[PDB]
Structure formats: C-alpha cells, structure tokens
Write a protein that binds this DNA or RNA. Structure first.
Length: 171
RNA sequence: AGAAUUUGGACAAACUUGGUCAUUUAGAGGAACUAAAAGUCGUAACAAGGUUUCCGUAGGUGAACCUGCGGAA
C-alpha cells in the first residue's frame, strides 16, 4: 500500500536540496519506504511489513504545497495540526489586487495575520494554504476571506488584535 | 533745389500767477453718530495596499547572490 504525491516544477529544486532532511523522519521515525520518481516528478511512499502512510503523505504534501521544511516537520509531528487549501475565486480588478490586499507592502498583512492567528499562510498567485489548529485556521480563514471580500484595514487589524488575545486566553 | 540775414507769419510743448478747480493745512475749535474682546490646554491629526517558491532574460557579475522585466503555482 502506497501513495503518490506529484511535485510541481516550481517546488522541485528545494525538495532536492532539502531532501536529506525530509526522508530521515520518513524512513526511521515513520517506518515507510520512500522513492522519488524522477520520471513522473513524484514521490512514492510504500509500506513495508516491518496508520502513518497518511502522515507521511501529508508531510510531503505540505512541502509540495509550499510550506517550508520545519513547518512540514511541525505537520508531521503535532497531531492537532491541520492545513486548509482554497483558491480565491470570490483579472485586473478582483484577482490582481485582492491578493495584493492579502499580502500588503512587503507581505506585512500576511505576517500580521500569521502572528495574530497562530497559523502560517503560504500565498500563491490565488491559492491560499493555511497551516494551524482548527480554530486557528477558522480565524485566519475568516480574516483572509474578509480582506478579499472588502473590509477596512482598521476593522481587520482590530479583529486581528482581538483574535490573538481571545485565542491565547483561558476562559 | 538750396544756407544766413529775413516780408507776412499763425501754431505753439514746457515754465510762472492763482483758480472757475481738485487737494493739504499752523493745526485748533464746535459736537453728533458708530465701533471697542477676559478664556490653561487640543493632536500630527493628514494617507495607499503584491508576499512565498521556482523559471527565463538583461545588468551588477566571487556565474553565488541582488535588482529590473517576462512567466509558473
């Protein structure tokens, strides 16, 4: 029993140079066997005779999606971690500057929402992936959807301050 | 044609006297009518929203990396 994760040709060279830190938790912590098909540009994970294949698939799928090495190791460990993918889909007007509104100047809005909601976000052209806990993904996604659908920067930043406080608060 | 000197010469700018004028007194009365300002400390208020990871190309190049431009997720 096996899984195949297709590595796109824009995350291929980081996979090869950081490959030597990717396969050791895949081959001794997880006890899988791992091959990298250079023909199909894919990663194959097979099970030996001696429920972790989905964990390894999510590990390399996070790296495939665009999350860094330590972020992917954080997904491989830390059972309470999830990752949500969505396109914008809500062109000059709407597509070419809603993503500029998520980013901001030097990505400071994305950095602010990452630190406020304790997720971390990779923003493609229009493909947003979010790695966090369940409630953390909920709040980061609500704020990202907010500032692609139109909200004032004061409103989204006040909501970010408030969500940081209430997510870290007991009671 | 045409110099002086000159027969008849009119026009005549500007200067002078004041105005028929407009304007100022030495400066001083009369004697109405209108106006008259007492309140620590108050700001920077003032404003837009292209990040990550590759790929090509031009330049700066230890051909590494950076920057600009063009694409991909």
């Amino acid at each position: 029993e096996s899984r195949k994760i297709m590595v796109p040709p824009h995350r291929m060279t980081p996979l090869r140079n950081s490959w030597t830190k990717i396969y050791p938790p895949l081959v001794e912590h997880l006890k899988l066997q791992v091959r990298m098909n250079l023909k199909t540009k894919s990663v194959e994970l097979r099970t030996n005779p001696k429920g972790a294949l989905q964990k390894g698939a999510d590990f390399i799928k996070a790296f495939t999606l665009g999350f860094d090495l330590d972020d992917s190791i954080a997904l491989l460990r830390l059972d309470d971690l999830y990752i949500e993918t969505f396109e914008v889909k809500d062109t000059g007007d709407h597509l070419s500057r809603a993503i500029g509104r998520i980013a901001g100047k030097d990505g400071k809005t994305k950095f602010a929402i990452e630190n406020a909601t304790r997720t971390r976000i990779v923003l493609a052209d229009s493909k947003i992936h979010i790695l966090g806990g369940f409630t953390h993904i909920r709040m980061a996604r609500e704020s990202v959807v907010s500032l692609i659908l139109g909200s004032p920067p004061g409103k989204v930043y006040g909501n970010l301050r408030t969500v940081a406080s209430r997510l870290k608060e007991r009671y």
